Design a protein around this ligand. Structure first.
Ligand SMILES: *[C@@H](C(=O)O)[C@H](O)C(=O)N[C@@H](CC(C)C)C(=O)NCCCCNC(N)=[NH2+]
Length: 212
């Protein structure tokens, strides 16, 4: 795998989103990976519905949090609508999948990256954007403005984001806190520190969709 990956430069990343007050990071993370794999496999970059996962992923808890794995399993078993068809409202509502016409995209499954393994995550990111989790509660992460973020942070992961690239010393993360946070909505998180958890627990739980 190459020394640098940046899926934005390959046209596989849609504009940075803002989840707002809703605890929907898990759906935004999943959607970033779906947008990415659909671009990688089909050549078209589309926006897909975080709101649909929020409403319809029965294993998740709406705006009270959820599981990227479970949203990706929802997209593989059923599908997902375009963001235009099923726009983001920042609140959980009734599942309206059935009323929004045929799905726009469908995946074939969900792999997990071997956790606590930097190279395994890097290998996956080289193939596609990956849903990853981290500790975002620390004021250092909340107030991050730029540079390669080293913490301070623990490994008490509580926030789902998407890895869309990496470099020699960092992993490139698309956050869902709007374009004004971090580096136009992104954070580069230091890697290669030898901490198996990853900085901020970044290697705790990583999933990506499979699409044949
Ligand atoms: C993240 C966010 O929107 O900022 C959000 O709080 C979230 O989904 N967090 C996850 C943790 C990471 C994905 C590791 C989470 O807490 N998932 C489990 C949901 C817990 C909610 N349970 C109940 N009973 N309300």
């Amino acid at each position: 795998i190459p020394e640098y990956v940046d899926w934005r430069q390959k046209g596989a990343v849609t504009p940075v989103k803002n989840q707002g007050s809703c605890g929907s990071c898990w759906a935004f993370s999943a959607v970033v990976t779906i947008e990415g794999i659909i671009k990688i496999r089909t050549g078209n970059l589309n926006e897909y519905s975080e709101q649909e996962l929020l409403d319809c992923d029965r294993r998740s808890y709406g705006c009270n949090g959820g599981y990227p794995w479970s949203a990706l399993q929802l997209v593989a078993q059923y599908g997902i609508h375009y963001r235009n068809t099923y726009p983001y409202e920042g609140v959980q509502r009734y599942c309206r999948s059935r009323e929004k016409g045929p799905y726009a995209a469908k995946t074939d499954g969900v792999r997990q990256v071997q956790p606590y393994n930097e190279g395994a995550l890097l290998y996956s990111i080289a193939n596609q954007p990956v849903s990853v989790v981290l500790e975002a509660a620390g004021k250092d992460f909340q107030l991050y403005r730029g540079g390669i973020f080293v913490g301070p942070c623990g490994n008490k992961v509580d926030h789902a984001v998407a890895a869309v690239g990496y470099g020699p010393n960092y992993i490139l993360i698309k956050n869902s806190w709007g374009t004004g946070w971090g580096e136009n909505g992104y954070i580069r998180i230091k890697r290669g520190t030898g901490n198996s958890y990853g900085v901020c627990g970044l290697y705790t739980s990583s999933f990506y969709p499979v699409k044949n």
